[PDB]
Amino acid sequence: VQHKLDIFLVSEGIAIKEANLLKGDSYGCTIKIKLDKEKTFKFVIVLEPEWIDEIKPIYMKVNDESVELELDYKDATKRIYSAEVVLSSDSVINLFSDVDVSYTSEYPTIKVNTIKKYYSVQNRGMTYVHIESPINTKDKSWFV
């Protein structure tokens, strides 16, 4: 059971590629943002799920508060959500299909420093997650 998942901190110009788990009907990711001043962030999440008969949704929590993902696009193959969030301090945003630990303990954890312009993968979890910055030309999607 092999879902595909890429997350794009477009505002900051960072692509989180393959945040999806190797095998398991579950996807999710956690980004820690280091931040000093009221900044807006646009998250675009592209979800390409294995064609199982229940496509679990991908919730988003900012500093342990839930935010509405907006479903920009759907087609046969992939769903694209989006969320614009005003952060004003060091903040963590949590993506998850599941809440029970047996899955979420897997999810990769990514570190963005808004201040001194580094990123990094704290944990790779059960994923082959990598990061492209600036965000690659091909992965251009979701405008209106």
JSON list of C-alpha atoms in Angstrom, two decimals:
[
{"chain": "A", "resi": 1, "resn": "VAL", "atom": "CA", "xyz": [0.00, 0.00, 0.00]},
{"chain": "A", "resi": 2, "resn": "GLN", "atom": "CA", "xyz": [2.13, 2.91, -1.41]},
{"chain": "A", "resi": 3, "resn": "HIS", "atom": "CA", "xyz": [0.76, 6.54, -1.22]},
{"chain": "A", "resi": 4, "resn": "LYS", "atom": "CA", "xyz": [2.79, 9.45, -2.74]},
{"chain": "A", "resi": 5, "resn": "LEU", "atom": "CA", "xyz": [3.00, 12.81, -0.84]},
{"chain": "A", "resi": 6, "resn": "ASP", "atom": "CA", "xyz": [4.98, 16.03, -1.54]},
{"chain": "A", "resi": 7, "resn": "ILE", "atom": "CA", "xyz": [4.52, 19.23, 0.58]},
{"chain": "A", "resi": 8, "resn": "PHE", "atom": "CA", "xyz": [5.54, 22.73, -0.66]},
{"chain": "A", "resi": 9, "resn": "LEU", "atom": "CA", "xyz": [6.27, 25.64, 1.74]},
{"chain": "A", "resi": 10, "resn": "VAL", "atom": "CA", "xyz": [5.89, 27.75, -1.44]},
{"chain": "A", "resi": 11, "resn": "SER", "atom": "CA", "xyz": [6.03, 31.15, 0.44]},
{"chain": "A", "resi": 12, "resn": "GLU", "atom": "CA", "xyz": [9.58, 30.20, 1.61]},
{"chain": "A", "resi": 13, "resn": "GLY", "atom": "CA", "xyz": [10.50, 28.25, -1.60]},
{"chain": "A", "resi": 14, "resn": "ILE", "atom": "CA", "xyz": [11.08, 24.74, -0.14]},
{"chain": "A", "resi": 15, "resn": "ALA", "atom": "CA", "xyz": [9.78, 21.39, -1.57]},
{"chain": "A", "resi": 16, "resn": "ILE", "atom": "CA", "xyz": [9.33, 18.47, 0.90]},
{"chain": "A", "resi": 17, "resn": "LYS", "atom": "CA", "xyz": [9.45, 15.52, -1.56]},
{"chain": "A", "resi": 18, "resn": "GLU", "atom": "CA", "xyz": [8.19, 11.99, -0.62]},
{"chain": "A", "resi": 19, "resn": "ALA", "atom": "CA", "xyz": [6.99, 12.75, 2.98]},
{"chain": "A", "resi": 20, "resn": "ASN", "atom": "CA", "xyz": [4.78, 9.62, 2.37]},
{"chain": "A", "resi": 21, "resn": "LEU", "atom": "CA", "xyz": [5.68, 6.38, 4.24]},
{"chain": "A", "resi": 22, "resn": "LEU", "atom": "CA", "xyz": [7.31, 3.53, 2.21]},
{"chain": "A", "resi": 23, "resn": "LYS", "atom": "CA", "xyz": [4.42, 1.07, 2.90]},
{"chain": "A", "resi": 24, "resn": "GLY", "atom": "CA", "xyz": [1.27, 1.85, 4.95]},
{"chain": "A", "resi": 25, "resn": "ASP", "atom": "CA", "xyz": [-2.20, 3.43, 4.35]},
{"chain": "A", "resi": 26, "resn": "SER", "atom": "CA", "xyz": [-1.06, 6.63, 6.16]},
{"chain": "A", "resi": 27, "resn": "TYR", "atom": "CA", "xyz": [0.69, 9.91, 5.13]},
{"chain": "A", "resi": 28, "resn": "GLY", "atom": "CA", "xyz": [1.84, 12.92, 7.17]},
{"chain": "A", "resi": 29, "resn": "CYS", "atom": "CA", "xyz": [4.77, 15.19, 8.04]},
{"chain": "A", "resi": 30, "resn": "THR", "atom": "CA", "xyz": [5.82, 17.73, 10.74]},
{"chain": "A", "resi": 31, "resn": "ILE", "atom": "CA", "xyz": [7.63, 21.03, 9.91]},
{"chain": "A", "resi": 32, "resn": "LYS", "atom": "CA", "xyz": [9.29, 23.10, 12.68]},
{"chain": "A", "resi": 33, "resn": "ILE", "atom": "CA", "xyz": [9.50, 26.81, 11.57]},
{"chain": "A", "resi": 34, "resn": "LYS", "atom": "CA", "xyz": [12.04, 29.11, 13.34]},
{"chain": "A", "resi": 35, "resn": "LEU", "atom": "CA", "xyz": [10.47, 32.60, 12.93]},
{"chain": "A", "resi": 36, "resn": "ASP", "atom": "CA", "xyz": [11.00, 36.15, 14.40]},
{"chain": "A", "resi": 37, "resn": "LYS", "atom": "CA", "xyz": [8.21, 38.33, 12.84]},
{"chain": "A", "resi": 38, "resn": "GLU", "atom": "CA", "xyz": [4.54, 38.01, 11.66]},
{"chain": "A", "resi": 39, "resn": "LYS", "atom": "CA", "xyz": [5.12, 36.10, 8.36]},
{"chain": "A", "resi": 40, "resn": "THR", "atom": "CA", "xyz": [2.48, 34.37, 6.11]},
{"chain": "A", "resi": 41, "resn": "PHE", "atom": "CA", "xyz": [3.18, 30.79, 4.89]},
{"chain": "A", "resi": 42, "resn": "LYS", "atom": "CA", "xyz": [1.47, 28.97, 1.96]},
{"chain": "A", "resi": 43, "resn": "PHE", "atom": "CA", "xyz": [1.48, 25.15, 2.24]},
{"chain": "A", "resi": 44, "resn": "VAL", "atom": "CA", "xyz": [0.51, 23.20, -0.93]},
{"chain": "A", "resi": 45, "resn": "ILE", "atom": "CA", "xyz": [0.21, 19.40, -0.36]},
{"chain": "A", "resi": 46, "resn": "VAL", "atom": "CA", "xyz": [0.01, 17.10, -3.46]},
{"chain": "A", "resi": 47, "resn": "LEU", "atom": "CA", "xyz": [-1.46, 13.66, -2.46]},
{"chain": "A", "resi": 48, "resn": "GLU", "atom": "CA", "xyz": [-1.28, 10.72, -4.92]},
{"chain": "A", "resi": 49, "resn": "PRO", "atom": "CA", "xyz": [-2.89, 7.88, -2.89]},
{"chain": "A", "resi": 50, "resn": "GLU", "atom": "CA", "xyz": [-2.76, 4.16, -3.78]},
{"chain": "A", "resi": 51, "resn": "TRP", "atom": "CA", "xyz": [-6.28, 3.34, -5.14]},
{"chain": "A", "resi": 52, "resn": "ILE", "atom": "CA", "xyz": [-7.52, 1.64, -1.91]},
{"chain": "A", "resi": 53, "resn": "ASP", "atom": "CA", "xyz": [-11.33, 1.98, -1.24]},
{"chain": "A", "resi": 54, "resn": "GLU", "atom": "CA", "xyz": [-10.95, 4.55, 1.65]},
{"chain": "A", "resi": 55, "resn": "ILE", "atom": "CA", "xyz": [-8.64, 7.56, 0.93]},
{"chain": "A", "resi": 56, "resn": "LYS", "atom": "CA", "xyz": [-7.88, 8.86, 4.49]},
{"chain": "A", "resi": 57, "resn": "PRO", "atom": "CA", "xyz": [-7.83, 12.72, 4.63]},
{"chain": "A", "resi": 58, "resn": "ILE", "atom": "CA", "xyz": [-4.69, 14.75, 5.62]},
{"chain": "A", "resi": 59, "resn": "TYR", "atom": "CA", "xyz": [-5.36, 17.10, 8.60]},
{"chain": "A", "resi": 60, "resn": "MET", "atom": "CA", "xyz": [-3.05, 20.06, 9.50]},
{"chain": "A", "resi": 61, "resn": "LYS", "atom": "CA", "xyz": [-2.39, 21.37, 13.09]},
{"chain": "A", "resi": 62, "resn": "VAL", "atom": "CA", "xyz": [-0.43, 24.66, 13.74]},
{"chain": "A", "resi": 63, "resn": "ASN", "atom": "CA", "xyz": [1.08, 24.79, 17.31]},
{"chain": "A", "resi": 64, "resn": "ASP", "atom": "CA", "xyz": [-1.49, 22.03, 18.18]},
{"chain": "A", "resi": 65, "resn": "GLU", "atom": "CA", "xyz": [-4.58, 23.85, 16.72]},
{"chain": "A", "resi": 66, "resn": "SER", "atom": "CA", "xyz": [-6.48, 22.51, 13.63]},
{"chain": "A", "resi": 67, "resn": "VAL", "atom": "CA", "xyz": [-6.58, 24.60, 10.36]},
{"chain": "A", "resi": 68, "resn": "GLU", "atom": "CA", "xyz": [-8.88, 24.12, 7.30]},
{"chain": "A", "resi": 69, "resn": "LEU", "atom": "CA", "xyz": [-7.00, 22.63, 4.29]},
{"chain": "A", "resi": 70, "resn": "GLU", "atom": "CA", "xyz": [-8.66, 23.96, 1.06]},
{"chain": "A", "resi": 71, "resn": "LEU", "atom": "CA", "xyz": [-8.93, 21.30, -1.72]},
{"chain": "A", "resi": 72, "resn": "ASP", "atom": "CA", "xyz": [-7.63, 23.33, -4.74]},
{"chain": "A", "resi": 73, "resn": "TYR", "atom": "CA", "xyz": [-7.85, 20.49, -7.33]},
{"chain": "A", "resi": 74, "resn": "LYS", "atom": "CA", "xyz": [-8.86, 16.83, -7.79]},
{"chain": "A", "resi": 75, "resn": "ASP", "atom": "CA", "xyz": [-8.26, 14.48, -10.76]},
{"chain": "A", "resi": 76, "resn": "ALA", "atom": "CA", "xyz": [-8.20, 10.65, -11.25]},
{"chain": "A", "resi": 77, "resn": "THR", "atom": "CA", "xyz": [-4.57, 10.33, -10.02]},
{"chain": "A", "resi": 78, "resn": "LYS", "atom": "CA", "xyz": [-3.90, 13.09, -7.36]},
{"chain": "A", "resi": 79, "resn": "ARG", "atom": "CA", "xyz": [-5.65, 15.52, -4.89]},
{"chain": "A", "resi": 80, "resn": "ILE", "atom": "CA", "xyz": [-4.10, 18.97, -4.04]},
{"chain": "A", "resi": 81, "resn": "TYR", "atom": "CA", "xyz": [-4.98, 20.77, -0.75]},
{"chain": "A", "resi": 82, "resn": "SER", "atom": "CA", "xyz": [-3.78, 24.26, 0.35]},
{"chain": "A", "resi": 83, "resn": "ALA", "atom": "CA", "xyz": [-3.55, 26.40, 3.55]},
{"chain": "A", "resi": 84, "resn": "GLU", "atom": "CA", "xyz": [-2.27, 30.02, 4.10]},
{"chain": "A", "resi": 85, "resn": "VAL", "atom": "CA", "xyz": [-1.27, 30.55, 7.80]},
{"chain": "A", "resi": 86, "resn": "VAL", "atom": "CA", "xyz": [-0.03, 33.70, 9.65]},
{"chain": "A", "resi": 87, "resn": "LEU", "atom": "CA", "xyz": [2.82, 32.64, 11.99]},
{"chain": "A", "resi": 88, "resn": "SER", "atom": "CA", "xyz": [4.36, 35.29, 14.35]},
{"chain": "A", "resi": 89, "resn": "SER", "atom": "CA", "xyz": [6.67, 33.03, 16.50]},
{"chain": "A", "resi": 90, "resn": "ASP", "atom": "CA", "xyz": [8.65, 29.72, 16.34]},
{"chain": "A", "resi": 91, "resn": "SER", "atom": "CA", "xyz": [5.87, 27.28, 15.23]},
{"chain": "A", "resi": 92, "resn": "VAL", "atom": "CA", "xyz": [5.38, 23.56, 14.37]},
{"chain": "A", "resi": 93, "resn": "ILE", "atom": "CA", "xyz": [2.80, 22.42, 11.79]},
{"chain": "A", "resi": 94, "resn": "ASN", "atom": "CA", "xyz": [1.67, 18.76, 11.94]},
{"chain": "A", "resi": 95, "resn": "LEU", "atom": "CA", "xyz": [0.23, 16.89, 8.91]},
{"chain": "A", "resi": 96, "resn": "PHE", "atom": "CA", "xyz": [-1.34, 13.44, 9.62]},
{"chain": "A", "resi": 97, "resn": "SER", "atom": "CA", "xyz": [-3.94, 11.01, 8.14]},
{"chain": "A", "resi": 98, "resn": "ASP", "atom": "CA", "xyz": [-3.87, 8.99, 11.43]},
{"chain": "A", "resi": 99, "resn": "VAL", "atom": "CA", "xyz": [-3.55, 10.14, 15.12]},
{"chain": "A", "resi": 100, "resn": "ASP", "atom": "CA", "xyz": [-2.77, 6.73, 16.84]},
{"chain": "A", "resi": 101, "resn": "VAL", "atom": "CA", "xyz": [1.06, 6.70, 17.41]},
{"chain": "A", "resi": 102, "resn": "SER", "atom": "CA", "xyz": [1.86, 3.38, 15.52]},
{"chain": "A", "resi": 103, "resn": "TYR", "atom": "CA", "xyz": [1.67, 5.47, 12.25]},
{"chain": "A", "resi": 104, "resn": "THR", "atom": "CA", "xyz": [2.42, 9.12, 13.35]},
{"chain": "A", "resi": 105, "resn": "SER", "atom": "CA", "xyz": [5.71, 8.06, 15.11]},
{"chain": "A", "resi": 106, "resn": "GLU", "atom": "CA", "xyz": [6.80, 7.20, 11.52]},
{"chain": "A", "resi": 107, "resn": "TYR", "atom": "CA", "xyz": [6.04, 10.64, 9.92]},
{"chain": "A", "resi": 108, "resn": "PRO", "atom": "CA", "xyz": [9.20, 12.57, 8.85]},
{"chain": "A", "resi": 109, "resn": "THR", "atom": "CA", "xyz": [10.08, 15.77, 10.80]},
{"chain": "A", "resi": 110, "resn": "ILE", "atom": "CA", "xyz": [11.55, 18.70, 8.75]},
{"chain": "A", "resi": 111, "resn": "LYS", "atom": "CA", "xyz": [13.30, 21.84, 10.16]},
{"chain": "A", "resi": 112, "resn": "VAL", "atom": "CA", "xyz": [13.03, 25.24, 8.37]},
{"chain": "A", "resi": 113, "resn": "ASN", "atom": "CA", "xyz": [15.01, 28.22, 9.77]},
{"chain": "A", "resi": 114, "resn": "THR", "atom": "CA", "xyz": [13.16, 31.30, 8.33]},
{"chain": "A", "resi": 115, "resn": "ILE", "atom": "CA", "xyz": [15.95, 33.40, 10.03]},
{"chain": "A", "resi": 116, "resn": "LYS", "atom": "CA", "xyz": [19.31, 32.03, 8.72]},
{"chain": "A", "resi": 117, "resn": "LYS", "atom": "CA", "xyz": [17.82, 30.23, 5.64]},
{"chain": "A", "resi": 118, "resn": "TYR", "atom": "CA", "xyz": [18.76, 26.54, 6.36]},
{"chain": "A", "resi": 119, "resn": "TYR", "atom": "CA", "xyz": [16.48, 23.46, 6.20]},
{"chain": "A", "resi": 120, "resn": "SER", "atom": "CA", "xyz": [17.09, 19.81, 7.29]},
{"chain": "A", "resi": 121, "resn": "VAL", "atom": "CA", "xyz": [15.27, 16.49, 8.00]},
{"chain": "A", "resi": 122, "resn": "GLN", "atom": "CA", "xyz": [15.41, 15.95, 11.81]},
{"chain": "A", "resi": 123, "resn": "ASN", "atom": "CA", "xyz": [14.04, 12.40, 11.16]},
{"chain": "A", "resi": 124, "resn": "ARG", "atom": "CA", "xyz": [13.48, 10.65, 7.75]},
{"chain": "A", "resi": 125, "resn": "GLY", "atom": "CA", "xyz": [10.90, 8.36, 9.48]},
{"chain": "A", "resi": 126, "resn": "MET", "atom": "CA", "xyz": [9.85, 5.32, 7.35]},
{"chain": "A", "resi": 127, "resn": "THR", "atom": "CA", "xyz": [10.30, 7.59, 4.24]},
{"chain": "A", "resi": 128, "resn": "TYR", "atom": "CA", "xyz": [12.83, 8.49, 1.48]},
{"chain": "A", "resi": 129, "resn": "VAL", "atom": "CA", "xyz": [11.95, 12.22, 2.04]},
{"chain": "A", "resi": 130, "resn": "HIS", "atom": "CA", "xyz": [14.22, 14.86, 0.36]},
{"chain": "A", "resi": 131, "resn": "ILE", "atom": "CA", "xyz": [14.00, 18.71, -0.01]},
{"chain": "A", "resi": 132, "resn": "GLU", "atom": "CA", "xyz": [14.45, 20.92, -3.17]},
{"chain": "A", "resi": 133, "resn": "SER", "atom": "CA", "xyz": [14.96, 24.75, -2.69]},
{"chain": "A", "resi": 134, "resn": "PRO", "atom": "CA", "xyz": [14.15, 26.77, -4.62]},
{"chain": "A", "resi": 135, "resn": "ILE", "atom": "CA", "xyz": [11.02, 24.64, -5.45]},
{"chain": "A", "resi": 136, "resn": "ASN", "atom": "CA", "xyz": [11.59, 22.96, -8.86]},
{"chain": "A", "resi": 137, "resn": "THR", "atom": "CA", "xyz": [9.99, 24.49, -12.05]},
{"chain": "A", "resi": 138, "resn": "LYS", "atom": "CA", "xyz": [8.05, 21.24, -12.94]},
{"chain": "A", "resi": 139, "resn": "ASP", "atom": "CA", "xyz": [6.14, 21.19, -9.58]},
{"chain": "A", "resi": 140, "resn": "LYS", "atom": "CA", "xyz": [4.17, 24.39, -10.56]},
{"chain": "A", "resi": 141, "resn": "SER", "atom": "CA", "xyz": [0.42, 24.13, -9.72]},
{"chain": "A", "resi": 142, "resn": "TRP", "atom": "CA", "xyz": [-2.47, 25.88, -7.83]},
{"chain": "A", "resi": 143, "resn": "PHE", "atom": "CA", "xyz": [-3.05, 29.54, -8.96]},
{"chain": "A", "resi": 144, "resn": "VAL", "atom": "CA", "xyz": [-6.45, 31.34, -8.50]}
]
